[PDB]
Design an enzyme around this catalytic site. Structure first.
Site, PDB file in Angstrom:
ATOM      1  CG  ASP A  19       6.907 -30.498 -16.990  1.00 21.92           C
ATOM      2  OD1 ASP A  19       8.149 -30.387 -16.934  1.00 21.92           O
ATOM      3  OD2 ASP A  19       6.319 -31.460 -17.577  1.00 21.92           O
ATOM      4  CE1 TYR A  36       4.541 -34.613 -22.365  1.00 25.65           C
ATOM      5  CE2 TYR A  36       4.417 -32.566 -21.181  1.00 25.65           C
ATOM      6  CZ  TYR A  36       4.878 -33.855 -21.277  1.00 25.65           C
ATOM      7  OH  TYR A  36       5.652 -34.386 -20.273  1.00 25.65           O
ATOM      8  CE  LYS A  45       9.167 -32.772 -19.285  1.00 25.16           C
ATOM      9  NZ  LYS A  45       7.798 -32.345 -19.643  1.00 25.16           N
ATOM     10  CG  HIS A  60      10.525 -35.857 -22.983  1.00 25.52           C
ATOM     11  ND1 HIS A  60       9.519 -35.154 -23.594  1.00 25.52           N
ATOM     12  CD2 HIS A  60       9.956 -36.541 -21.973  1.00 25.52           C
ATOM     13  CE1 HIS A  60       8.379 -35.402 -22.967  1.00 25.52           C
ATOM     14  NE2 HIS A  60       8.602 -36.275 -21.970  1.00 25.52           N
TER      15      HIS A  60
HETATM   16  N1  LIG Z   1       9.340 -36.392 -18.111  1.00 24.97           N
HETATM   17  C1  LIG Z   1       8.466 -37.228 -18.641  1.00 24.97           C
HETATM   18  O1  LIG Z   1       8.742 -38.236 -19.251  1.00 24.97           O
HETATM   19  C2  LIG Z   1       7.062 -37.089 -17.998  1.00 24.97           C
HETATM   20  C3  LIG Z   1       6.209 -38.238 -17.967  1.00 24.97           C
HETATM   21  C4  LIG Z   1       4.897 -38.203 -17.394  1.00 24.97           C
HETATM   22  C5  LIG Z   1       4.517 -36.945 -16.856  1.00 24.97           C
HETATM   23  N2  LIG Z   1       5.398 -35.833 -16.914  1.00 24.97           N
HETATM   24  C6  LIG Z   1       4.910 -34.468 -16.461  1.00 24.97           C
HETATM   25  O2  LIG Z   1       4.283 -34.713 -15.184  1.00 24.97           O
HETATM   26  C7  LIG Z   1       2.935 -34.130 -15.149  1.00 24.97           C
HETATM   27  C8  LIG Z   1       2.077 -34.855 -14.119  1.00 24.97           C
HETATM   28  O3  LIG Z   1       2.038 -36.285 -14.478  1.00 24.97           O
HETATM   29  P1  LIG Z   1       0.729 -36.916 -15.167  1.00 24.97           P
HETATM   30  O4  LIG Z   1       0.105 -35.926 -16.100  1.00 24.97           O
HETATM   31  O5  LIG Z   1       1.174 -38.221 -15.698  1.00 24.97           O
HETATM   32  O6  LIG Z   1      -0.298 -37.190 -13.977  1.00 24.97           O
HETATM   33  P2  LIG Z   1      -0.659 -36.738 -12.508  1.00 24.97           P
HETATM   34  O7  LIG Z   1      -0.274 -35.322 -12.303  1.00 24.97           O
HETATM   35  O8  LIG Z   1      -0.131 -37.729 -11.539  1.00 24.97           O
HETATM   36  O9  LIG Z   1      -2.230 -36.968 -12.571  1.00 24.97           O
HETATM   37  C9  LIG Z   1      -3.059 -36.212 -13.444  1.00 24.97           C
HETATM   38  C10 LIG Z   1      -4.500 -36.750 -13.301  1.00 24.97           C
HETATM   39  O10 LIG Z   1      -4.956 -36.469 -11.995  1.00 24.97           O
HETATM   40  C11 LIG Z   1      -6.131 -35.706 -12.018  1.00 24.97           C
HETATM   41  N3  LIG Z   1      -6.121 -34.853 -10.891  1.00 24.97           N
HETATM   42  C12 LIG Z   1      -5.371 -33.683 -10.716  1.00 24.97           C
HETATM   43  N4  LIG Z   1      -5.574 -33.069  -9.580  1.00 24.97           N
HETATM   44  C13 LIG Z   1      -6.504 -33.869  -8.958  1.00 24.97           C
HETATM   45  C14 LIG Z   1      -7.094 -33.674  -7.682  1.00 24.97           C
HETATM   46  N5  LIG Z   1      -6.868 -32.679  -6.830  1.00 24.97           N
HETATM   47  N6  LIG Z   1      -8.025 -34.652  -7.311  1.00 24.97           N
HETATM   48  C15 LIG Z   1      -8.356 -35.753  -8.129  1.00 24.97           C
HETATM   49  N7  LIG Z   1      -7.767 -35.918  -9.370  1.00 24.97           N
HETATM   50  C16 LIG Z   1      -6.832 -34.952  -9.763  1.00 24.97           C
HETATM   51  C17 LIG Z   1      -6.094 -34.941 -13.338  1.00 24.97           C
HETATM   52  O11 LIG Z   1      -7.478 -34.777 -13.727  1.00 24.97           O
HETATM   53  P3  LIG Z   1      -8.005 -33.416 -14.470  1.00 24.97           P
HETATM   54  O12 LIG Z   1      -6.874 -32.942 -15.308  1.00 24.97           O
HETATM   55  O13 LIG Z   1      -9.209 -33.900 -15.251  1.00 24.97           O
HETATM   56  O14 LIG Z   1      -8.374 -32.498 -13.298  1.00 24.97           O
HETATM   57  C18 LIG Z   1      -5.510 -36.031 -14.241  1.00 24.97           C
HETATM   58  O15 LIG Z   1      -6.459 -37.030 -14.640  1.00 24.97           O
HETATM   59  C19 LIG Z   1       2.534 -34.337 -16.662  1.00 24.97           C
HETATM   60  O16 LIG Z   1       1.350 -33.649 -17.009  1.00 24.97           O
HETATM   61  C20 LIG Z   1       3.840 -33.855 -17.350  1.00 24.97           C
HETATM   62  O17 LIG Z   1       3.852 -32.418 -17.253  1.00 24.97           O
HETATM   63  C21 LIG Z   1       6.692 -35.847 -17.476  1.00 24.97           C
HETATM   64  O1  LIG Z   2       6.427 -37.503 -22.040  1.00 26.62           O
HETATM   65  C1  LIG Z   2       5.647 -37.653 -21.130  1.00 26.62           C
HETATM   66  O2  LIG Z   2       5.486 -36.743 -20.325  1.00 26.62           O
HETATM   67  C2  LIG Z   2       4.856 -38.944 -20.956  1.00 26.62           C
HETATM   68  C3  LIG Z   2       4.242 -39.513 -22.265  1.00 26.62           C
HETATM   69  C4  LIG Z   2       4.009 -41.021 -21.970  1.00 26.62           C
HETATM   70  C5  LIG Z   2       5.179 -41.929 -21.955  1.00 26.62           C
HETATM   71  N1  LIG Z   2       6.190 -41.819 -22.671  1.00 26.62           N
HETATM   72  C6  LIG Z   2       6.987 -42.989 -22.574  1.00 26.62           C
HETATM   73  C7  LIG Z   2       8.270 -43.230 -23.347  1.00 26.62           C
HETATM   74  C8  LIG Z   2       8.914 -42.308 -24.410  1.00 26.62           C
HETATM   75  C9  LIG Z   2      10.224 -42.529 -24.866  1.00 26.62           C
HETATM   76  C10 LIG Z   2      10.995 -43.591 -24.319  1.00 26.62           C
HETATM   77  C11 LIG Z   2      10.418 -44.449 -23.325  1.00 26.62           C
HETATM   78  N2  LIG Z   2      11.113 -45.515 -22.758  1.00 26.62           N
HETATM   79  O3  LIG Z   2      10.495 -46.163 -21.918  1.00 26.62           O
HETATM   80  O4  LIG Z   2      12.253 -45.709 -23.137  1.00 26.62           O
HETATM   81  C12 LIG Z   2       9.097 -44.257 -22.839  1.00 26.62           C
HETATM   82  N3  LIG Z   2       6.410 -43.805 -21.769  1.00 26.62           N
HETATM   83  O5  LIG Z   2       5.237 -43.152 -21.348  1.00 26.62           O
END
Ligand SMILES: NC(=O)c1ccc[n+]([C@@H]2O[C@H](COP(=O)([O-])OP(=O)(O)OC[C@H]3O[C@@H](n4cnc5c(N)ncnc54)[C@H](OP(=O)(O)O)[C@@H]3O)[C@@H](O)[C@H]2O)c1
Ligand SMILES: O=C(O)CCCc1nc(-c2cccc([N+](=O)[O-])c2)no1
Length: 316
Positions: free
Chosen positions: A44, A49, A78, A111
């Site tokens: 992803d 990013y 995205k 996104h």
């Molecule tokens: N669509 C969007 O708007 C959006 C928004 C937010 C996120 N996302 C996607 O979702 C992915 C995941 O969400 P996120 O990055 O917010 O956070 P997450 O996956 O919930 O958490 C990541 C954190 O957890 C730690 N971690 C990972 N595996 C672990 C394990 N087994 N034990 C303990 N800690 C662990 C990682 O540390 P280390 O890396 O140091 O190991 C990092 O600090 C993002 O990276 C992105 O690709 C998309």
């Molecule tokens: O893109 C990602 O994966 C996460 C980056 C962190 C993050 N982005 C936003 C963000 C970006 C655009 C719009 C909103 N909104 O709330 O309308 C929030 N809130 O938090």
């Protein structure tokens, strides 16, 4: 449990992927290489990013090394908010493709529903810190996304952070050519999303859960914030199944028929996080995890709360 879910475009999507938001550019090439080595086939990504070039180095080396075939990979990126204008969408996609060193994406998502003014700034602000919107609306952006399918740049298109009214708006778009394949949304035991998930699934839209671990490295973490990984109630379920807490938090959305995309740059954790296909949470465990809902969001920016299209005023 099967490893892929069938999308409404006829393709199969691995239900476990590697997240890359906040993965440092000097660490994420090795992180993706390790992920592919230990079985991940879904990555992803996002232009915003600022690490897609480095992710691409990893993907390309493993393709060249013949560790995996391109057809076996599922690469998602995205469209950022400042590129919702029709005339900017193809370029934005093509830059992602060039950085990732791919000739197609398996899935490209809008996104956020919120368009921002185009230009170099990803978050253009006015003098008092409000984001500057664009006048494009989601339905024209969607038609631009459909064009990418028809030009061969992407195999599937979808949306992210769309609320139920916003999904509905796309589904009711006049002349809709391709339905969204995926809605990627925040989802974890403190933000369980039952209403939005059942709506999306009832329409054949697959839901991807982001921040499944509660994003402990999010830049704005505050002491008083709840912590999934540290929640003794979840630790206990993990203990009972002889798994780690993170493994429980990854398995939980998989049993709701979701795709899940935990992020790590730590090799041992990358491996740990993939070892979730050899146990089952009980229905009772699942209902217990659902009961921890408190409508807590990692991702909701104050600077966007007056945008017309801000997704989180509505309940869901
Ligand atoms: N669509 C969007 O708007 C959006 C928004 C937010 C996120 N996302 C996607 O979702 C992915 C995941 O969400 P996120 O990055 O917010 O956070 P997450 O996956 O919930 O958490 C990541 C954190 O957890 C730690 N971690 C990972 N595996 C672990 C394990 N087994 N034990 C303990 N800690 C662990 C990682 O540390 P280390 O890396 O140091 O190991 C990092 O600090 C993002 O990276 C992105 O690709 C998309
Ligand atoms: O893109 C990602 O994966 C996460 C980056 C962190 C993050 N982005 C936003 C963000 C970006 C655009 C719009 C909103 N909104 O709330 O309308 C929030 N809130 O938090």
């Amino acid at each position: 449990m099967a490893s892929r879910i069938l999308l409404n475009n006829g393709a199969k999507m691995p239900i476990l992927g590697l997240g890359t938001w906040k993965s440092p550019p000097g660490q994420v090439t090795e992180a993706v290489k390790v992920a592919i080595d230990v079985g991940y086939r879904h990555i992803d990504c996002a232009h915003v990013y600022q690490n897609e070039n480095e992710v691409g180095v990893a993907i390309q080396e493993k393709l060249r090394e013949q560790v995996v075939k391109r057809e076996e990979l599922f690469i998602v990126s995205k469209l950022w908010c400042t590129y919702h204008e029709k005339g900017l969408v193809k370029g934005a996609c093509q830059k992602t493709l060039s950085d990732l060193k791919l000739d197609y994406l398996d899935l490209y998502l809008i996104h956020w529903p919120t368009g921002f003014k185009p230009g170099k700034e990803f978050f253009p602000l006015d003098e008092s810190g409000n984001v500057v919107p664009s006048d494009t609306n989601i339905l024209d952006t969607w038609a631009a996304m459909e064009e990418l399918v028809d030009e061969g740049l992407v195999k599937a298109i979808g949306i992210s952070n769309f609320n139920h009214l916003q999904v509905e708006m796309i589904l009711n778009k006049p002349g809709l050519k391709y339905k969204p394949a995926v809605n990627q949304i925040e989802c974890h035991p403190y933000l369980t999303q039952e209403k939005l998930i059942q709506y999306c699934q009832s329409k054949g839209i697959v839901v991807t859960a982001y921040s499944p671990l509660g994003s402990p490295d999010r830049p704005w973490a505050k002491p008083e914030d709840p912590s999934l990984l540290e929640d003794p109630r979840i630790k206990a379920i993990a203990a009972k199944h002889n798994k780690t807490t993170a493994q429980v938090l990854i398995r939980f959305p998989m049993q709701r028929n979701l795709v899940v995309i935990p992020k790590s740059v730590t090799p041992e954790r990358i491996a740990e996080n993939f070892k979730v296909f050899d146990f089952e949470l009980s229905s009772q465990d699942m209902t217990t995890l659902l009961s921890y809902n408190r409508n807590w969001r990692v991702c909701a920016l104050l600077s966007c709360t007056s945008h017309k299209d801000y997704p989180f005023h509505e309940e869901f």
